[PDB]
Amino acid sequence: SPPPPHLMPYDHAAEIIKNKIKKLENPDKRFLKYASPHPILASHNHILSAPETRVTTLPNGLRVATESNLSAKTATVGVWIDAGSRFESDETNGTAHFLEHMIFKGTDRRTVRALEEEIEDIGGHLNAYTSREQTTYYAKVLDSNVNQALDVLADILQNSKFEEQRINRERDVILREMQEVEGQTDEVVLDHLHATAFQYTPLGRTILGPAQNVKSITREDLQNYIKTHYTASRMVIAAAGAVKHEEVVEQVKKLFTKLSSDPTTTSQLVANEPASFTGSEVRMIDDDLPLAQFAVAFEGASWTDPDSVALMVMQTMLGSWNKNVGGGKHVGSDLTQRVAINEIAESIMAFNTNYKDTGLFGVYAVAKADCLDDLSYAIMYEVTKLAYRVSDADVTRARNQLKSSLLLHMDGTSPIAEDIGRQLLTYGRRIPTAELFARIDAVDASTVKRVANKYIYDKDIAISAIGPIQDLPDYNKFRRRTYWNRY
């Protein structure tokens, strides 16, 4: 007689796993009645009802935009300026970043101690951020201190002192940063990508600028920069939260009186010095680094180009992923599936950068040296596949994810304020959610194929890589992988 099917240790363990499997065989329909794995395009214009965004253009061309939520206890108010490193010159490059460092260094009325002590007396926050085409200073304060924050912003923008000793002290802080450009290689790979893709254009320069420029920065250079660029028609004052439109507009009229009024316009500057894409690459070989990071980018679309919306959907189709994501092997993005299933990267991210007249569309990835060859094949395959095969399910799911992400990231007064300021600068208006969702919904599978055929298929690319990148495919291998010869 043979043993019963529990005596042997291996037989007993086989019974346990067989019982667990039978348990999974019979699902319960109470928990399978609403959720569905099939993506469906849904129209819910009713739920996207939002507070009105009031826009007022002042006599001098100054624009004041507010989003009123009087239920909130705090508010975010700030100035968004159409100025950046793109609008400087080769000799003046780096002044905008220098100005950001010196903008909180005291005015005629308030010293540096007076400025900081005033702000943290009310528990406020002062933020300054400058990019290639946009500069912003904003304050997060309580509801009662909106008027006080507006006074602070107007004073620093109009009556900054720029002491000689403070300029010299700040000259060394930035010079130290320019020699310590390390520890954040994401900001370095993209900086080199801009430098090589936008060669010999204003858009290829870095925000920091060259070390000789910061060494030559004086008081007059900073004053000339403000007088040239910080003009009434290039500035937008955006407030969100517990703010009343009338009170903000009245205070803006009172404070922002001595603006430059220089007739320089942002559309003429872009026209006279246009940005163009050049296929090229920069490879920073360093075998001591443990991980290799690279970015391959195509020429993208400008802000107001209607294909930019389709590029946002295409960016969601490629997706983003890192090792700490739990379900990378099951997401709808095929590129993420290939990376997560075969473990050929530490992180991957598709980016879509828009500018006034051009843009960048590409993929940034971090991986070990021995994964670079298979990773490069996977990235180029899935990017090129967008011009050949696009499923309706994939494009619908990316449409659903793009809608959700654009509204779920608008949480807080500060994100709303920057959405108001950024849109008023790039589009000249705040695009209502309903219109934005209607443009996203117009991007179907045929639209994706047409846009990919225009930007991706048989197009030159820009690569910026750093680290142990000896096994990264060369330019000709990437260039060849932009089309399929079987079609």
Partner: peptide, 28 residues
């Protein structure tokens, strides 16, 4: 619906090559 166009495109190439290697102009 591009696999079908791929097949039709390659069928034209196969026909074009066949008339090119074998040139049966004196037979048609």
């Amino acid at each position: 619906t591009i696999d079908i166009q791929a097949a039709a495109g390659w069928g034209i190439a196969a026909a074009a090559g066949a008339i090119w290697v074998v040139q049966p102009f004196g037979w048609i």
